[PDB]
Design a protein around this ligand. Structure first.
Ligand SMILES: CC(=O)N[C@@H]1[C@@H](O[C@@H]2O[C@@H](C)[C@H](O)[C@@H](O)[C@H]2O)[C@H](O)[C@@H](CO)O[C@H]1O
Ligand SMILES: CC(=O)N[C@@H]1[C@@H](O[C@@H]2O[C@@H](C)[C@H](O)[C@@H](O)[C@H]2O)[C@H](O)[C@@H](CO)O[C@H]1O
Ligand SMILES: Nc1ccn([C@@H]2O[C@H](COP(=O)(O)O)[C@@H](O)[C@H]2O)c(=O)n1
Ligand SMILES: Nc1ccn([C@@H]2O[C@H](COP(=O)(O)O)[C@@H](O)[C@H]2O)c(=O)n1
Ligand SMILES: O=C(O)[C@@]1(O)C[C@@H](O)[C@@H](O)[C@@H]([C@H](O)CO)O1
Ligand SMILES: O=C(O)[C@@]1(O)C[C@@H](O)[C@@H](O)[C@@H]([C@H](O)CO)O1
Ligand code: NA
Ligand code: NA
Ligand code: NA
Ligand code: NA
Lengths: 390, 390
């Protein structure tokens, strides 16, 4: 059985922050699941149905329906208490973002004590768990898992998303976004890797539309801004922020040569009278008119690499190791492995059968084969003609 | 003679960051001044005259004219080298904001070595200095000053500004914005302090217009946002940022009860579809329609206190000690002392005669007397009827 960990702590000021993954697992569930979460994940259906998770375009794009009493009663629930969250805040001077960073990057002994108490609250629970699944890093939970002998798959929506791309997801046994294992997996297959496809072929395989035509007018430098309170910008950012990213670029380019694109999910937008503000319908059309791209650790960085743009990546993230290679050919090879073996087809990370497949730690070849099979209806060879056939 | 320190390091991506204070001291100069700055402070008049310092409304409000060759040739110049700035950046992983924070809060031995070398480059220079003046904290410079036996007045525009208020300035021997001495000065006059005026009287004395009428409609909580790369938000902020300030408030109020006002000087503005976004012509009209106010350490916080609003002050700043008092009466007394003795009438901090007056460390009574005299055309008594007469 899966034990899916969906923390209810509203670090960013919003109840049931990870509600979409709750609804996705419930909808795809083929077995009884053990949810470790908050009661907020169960009520909210009662007066804020103006949230994006309830939007029909959200549901169609992510492929889930809303649950009912029957759908939810099929599973088991362990609910965390809010009193620990209140205590956590005061231990970080009442800063919820700081507390969020601690949650992501430090063991919290009181939380380990509660998780142990909950897992033990009913006998047989622990022995039925085949793996934990967590939507974010959590050293409290990971310490608990070591003690009980259980693995932890970290899982999230990936850097390529619909409608521009095939939906992808992350699945990492060590950590998602921060502390990933993508680099280590690649360096063991670097020996026998020679992708014959070009970078554009790789990009086109995952694009649902054709890449944009030439922009005609370009800007020397593009700046990707991100969501200010995403785990990427508060814990994995090497201390960089949007404004210091801007400053970093201003050490190199005049104002006239900087094109800035705010994140559509951010609470803030750029004012007009300072920089040239991108207005493209999507980040690829913005990338298309820049000579080089600057980011902390936004998904758009991978788009920039996949289109052959010089990219600066200031924070920690899953694809950074690709940007640290010196050549276009090493880049293609690393990129192919990242797209076809590290990234998972979105629906599969919610497929209990596929999760048990990965819990057996199969060879990379087997991993790439399963993904190519889903995308379609030697590891270099599989990819090589997978691109050609497509 | 004054030795005015105006660092040229473009931490925020803009040459001659402190150019207005250069122009203000040059314009008010009644003696030869020793400027320690960059050559950028001397050229920029040559293609970015679209900066606010060149705006006629800027000049009229701050009371300076542009300098010419004659005006500038009256003084002496020691220019810092850029190679140290390049080295400083790489020592902070190329993050200019982080380097800025280090500059404000750490000794930098290479900079001390350069300042010493410059001050010694011409004999007689050091012996002619009566005090350093610095527009920001700088432990490098302060260490140098200790060695040579010189004081350091930290000086800046204050929390009350034209056109809403009489212009004020800061003058602090220990530190401006961070590490101030306003609290310590107050606690030595707390004994003999009984201001009979009300809080509204104090506020009205500094207002150039009458306070706004009642708003009719209110919001439970107002959120003051600040400029992201101001020294207040990067070094004196106790790690809080705009987005975590928002999160702090969202732990207490529903979205429907939050009114947010972005800073007019910030590069970012709020999008409309999330919170109610303030549109007031000034921060007092925004304050007027809030039941309580939340800030990191914005000047607007002092406005909120002066109007009797419950205020939360999360960062370090000059007026925090006022907010830490429990009562309205202790609050008035502390507020009166802050407005009349800690804050300086703006023009005076550029008046060499007045600076020599403060370098003699006179009694608080003498300080309050000089300021009230300027504003007009026992320490409790002086203030009491200064408010009444006005
Ligand atoms: C599916 C998707 O992209 N949703 C966006 C939200 O991001 C997702 O949900 C949050 C709760 C997690 O922290 C994210 O890592 C991600 O899984 C995003 O929060 C909002 C706006 O910021 O936009 C949605 O479209
Ligand atoms: C006089 C004034 O208020 N100017 C504003 C600028 O602030 C001043 O100049 C900068 C360089 C210092 O860092 C500040 O502490 C302050 O002295 C401000 O930078 C800009 C926009 O941010 O707006 C001016 O009006
Ligand atoms: N400045 C930005 C950042 C992200 N984005 C979009 O948001 C999605 C996720 O990007 P982050 O990883 O930066 O949150 C990207 O794939 C892209 O579609 C954008 O359109 N503009
Ligand atoms: N959110 C904000 C912050 C500041 N301000 C204005 O900017 C001036 C300086 O405020 P900071 O100290 O926050 O930079 C204030 O006196 C006020 O006039 C504003 O109008 N809205
Ligand atoms: O909210 C986050 O934790 C972040 C993580 C990223 O990996 C990604 O999901 C990102 C979203 O794109 C923000 O909209 O948010
Ligand atoms: O830029 C800064 O260092 C800050 C300091 C504040 O004391 C004040 O001058 C503030 C400005 O109000 C920002 O516009 O900036
Ligand atoms: Na395609
Ligand atoms: Na590279
Ligand atoms: Na008045
Ligand atoms: Na108080």
């Amino acid at each position: 059985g899966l034990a899916v960990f969906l923390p209810p702590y509203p670090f960013r000021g919003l109840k049931a922050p990870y509600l979409w993954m709750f609804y996705k697992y419930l909808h795809c569930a083929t077995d009884s699941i053990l949810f470790i979460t908050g009661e907020d994940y169960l009520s909210v259906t009662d007066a804020q149905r103006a949230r994006w998770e309830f939007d029909p375009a959200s549901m169609a794009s992510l492929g889930y329906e809303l649950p009912n009493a029957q759908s939810m009663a099929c599973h088991e629930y362990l609910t965390l208490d809010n009193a620990f969250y209140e205590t956590l805040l005061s231990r970080h001077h009442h800063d919820p973002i700081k507390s969020f960073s601690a949650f992501l990057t430090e063991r919290i002994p009181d939380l380990e004590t509660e998780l142990h108490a909950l897992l033990d609250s009913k006998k047989g629970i622990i022995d039925q768990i085949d793996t934990f699944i967590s939507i974010c890093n959590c050293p409290s939970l990971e310490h608990v898992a070591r003690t009980l002998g259980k693995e932890v798959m970290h899982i999230e929506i990936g850097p390529l998303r619909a409608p521009m791309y095939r939906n992808t997801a992350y699945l990492d046994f060590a950590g998602v976004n921060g502390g990933t294992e993508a680099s280590a997996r690649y360096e063991k297959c670097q020996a026998e890797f020679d992708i014959k496809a070009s970078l554009g072929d790789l990009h086109n395989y995952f694009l649902e539309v054709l890449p944009p035509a030439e922009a005609a007018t370009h800007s020397a430098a593009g700046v990707v801004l991100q969501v200010e309170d995403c785990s990427n910008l508060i814990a994995y950012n090497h201390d960089f922020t949007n404004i210091s990213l801007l400053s970093y670029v201003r050490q190199r380019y005049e104002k006239e040569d900087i094109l800035v694109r705010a994140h559509p999910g951010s609470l803030f937008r750029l004012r007009d009278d300072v920089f040239t503000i991108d207005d493209s319908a999507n980040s690829l059309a913005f990338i298309n008119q820049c000579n080089e791209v600057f980011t902390i650790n936004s998904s758009v960085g991978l788009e920039a690499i996949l289109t052959g743009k010089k990219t600066t990546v200031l924070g920690d993230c899953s694809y950074a190791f690709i940007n640290e290679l010196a050549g276009a050919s090493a880049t293609v090879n690393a990129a192919a492995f990242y797209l076809f073996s590290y990234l998972v087809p979105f629906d599969l990370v919610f497929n209990q059968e596929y999760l048990k497949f990965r819990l057996g730690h199969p060879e990379e070849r087997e991993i790439v084969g399963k993904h190519i099979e889903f995308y379609s209806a030697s590891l270099s060879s599989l990819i090589n003609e997978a691109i050609s056939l497509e």
